[PDB]
């Protein structure tokens, strides 16, 4: 809801994603909605993701990614981290900053 996103499209999304290692961040952007919102929602769901409010996507902050979406989704595996940070990490500093994530998003 934190990103104006609607149950049955997070629903939706983490039914294809509720196996363990058949993540793929792009598709799933897609499914819960996300790719077609605002910036303005696009920085408010990074701003949630952000649990320590440190301004970055830490790697340990990504790996708890979905359950954002829904407190009983699952963590990520190590290998889908490395692949979403890999995908979203453009500056190397192994975190993702607000302009990376948006940026990401837009595909
Ligand atoms: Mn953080
Ligand atoms: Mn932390
Ligand atoms: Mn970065």
């Known amino acids: 809801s934190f990103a104006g996103l609607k149950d049955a499209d997070v629903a939706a999304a983490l039914a294809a994603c509720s ?9 799933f952007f897609a499914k819960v909605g996300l790719a077609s919102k605002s ?14 409010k440190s301004g970055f996507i830490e790697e340990d902050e990504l790996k708890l990614f979905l359950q954002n979406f829904s407190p009983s989704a699952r963590a990520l595996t190590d290998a889908e981290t490395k692949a979403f940070l ?13 302009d990376e994530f948006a940026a990401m998003i837009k595909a």
């Open 19 to 27: 196996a363990a290692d058949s993540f793929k961040h792009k598709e």
């Open 39 to 52: 910036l303005d929602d696009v920085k408010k769901a990074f701003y949630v993701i952000d649990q320590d």
């Open 86 to 98: 890999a995908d979203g990490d453009k500056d190397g500093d192994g975190m993702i900053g607000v």
